[PDB]
Amino acid sequence: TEFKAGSAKKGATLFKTRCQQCHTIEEGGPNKVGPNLHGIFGRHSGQVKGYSYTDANINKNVKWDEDSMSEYLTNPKKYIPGTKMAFGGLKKEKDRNDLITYLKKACE
Amino acid sequence: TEFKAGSAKKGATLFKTRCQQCHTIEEGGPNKVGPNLHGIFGRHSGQVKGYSYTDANINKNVKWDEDSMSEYLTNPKKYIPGTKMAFGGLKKEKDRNDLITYLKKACE
Ligand code: HEC
Numbered sequence: 292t293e294f295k296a297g298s299a300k301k302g303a304t305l306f307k308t309r310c311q312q313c314h315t316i317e318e319g320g321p322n323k324v325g326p327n328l329h330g331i332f333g334r335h336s337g338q339v340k341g342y343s344y345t346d347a348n349i350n351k352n353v354k355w356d357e358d359s360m361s362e363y364l365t366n367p368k369k370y371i372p373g374t375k376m377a378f379g380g381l382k383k384e385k386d387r388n389d390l391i392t393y394l395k396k397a398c399e
Numbered sequence: 400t401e402f403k404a405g406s407a408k409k410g411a412t413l414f415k416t417r418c419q420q421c422h423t424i425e426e427g428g429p430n431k432v433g434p435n436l437h438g439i440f441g442r443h444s445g446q447v448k449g450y451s452y453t454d455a456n457i458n459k460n461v462k463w464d465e466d467s468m469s470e471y472l473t474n475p476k477k478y479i480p481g482t483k484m485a486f487g488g489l490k491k492e493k494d495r496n497d498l499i500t501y502l503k504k505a506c507e
Pocket residue numbers: 306309310311312313314324325326328331335336337338339343344345346347348364373374375376377378381
């Protein structure tokens with residue numbers, strides 16, 4: 292594909308307003324409705340310890356990158372049918388760019 | 400009209416990313432390409448001291464409120480023909496809501 296960096300401040304607010312409801316992102320933050328996402332780009336789907344994932348996400352075995360991430364957030368279920376993440380998606384690239392910007396920084 | 404409160408954190412990033420280029424908002428911040436906007440909702444257009452406004456904005460005599468503001472940011476020049484603010488506008492209400500949210504808080 293093609294992915295460009297947007298704004299990490301903007302990505303920050305999007306997170307707080309769209310993801311934080313179900314996820315933490317900090318090193319050592321708790322699993323909640325969703326799994327903790329710290330360190331995600333160095334991992335594959337369904338590997339956070341103690342988190343109960345659907346068969347769907349485990350089997351998908353997604354190696355998370357800025358590119359897999361942009362497609363996933365477009366529409367989570369289209370990408371991972373069976374997934375229990377209840378989020379419609381981020382339709383705008385601009386939106387996904389900003390957010391993945393932040394994630395990439397914050398997840399490391 | 401009708402104006403609803405969105406997010407002040409989101410409004411914050413929008414500012415930094417869309418307005419800050421030309422405006423400061425803090426009490427005692429400097430005039431720049433644009434006038435300082437601290438205290439704007441208690442004022443009419445073209446009254447900041449030392450700022451050189453166009454005849455256009457002065458004559459318009461806009462009493463700035465969440466409602467005049469939402470329409471202005473839709474398209475500044477459509478609202479104030481002759482105005483020298485070079486910004487296309489914020490097409491989404493959602494976007495304007497967030498931003499006016501922040502402004503209202505930050506401008507006081
Ligand atoms: C609650 C309503 C959620 C919101 C809002 C978001 N996510 Fe989510 N996420 C949620 C669940 C229940 C799950 C588990 C899915 C399963 O089938 O097990 C997830 C999963 C993810 C993942 C997968 C990571 C992995 O370890 O495989 C990612 C990358 C993820 N969520 C990211 C994410 C972002 C960035 C969000 C905000 C736009 C977001 N999710 C929203 C629950 C919820």
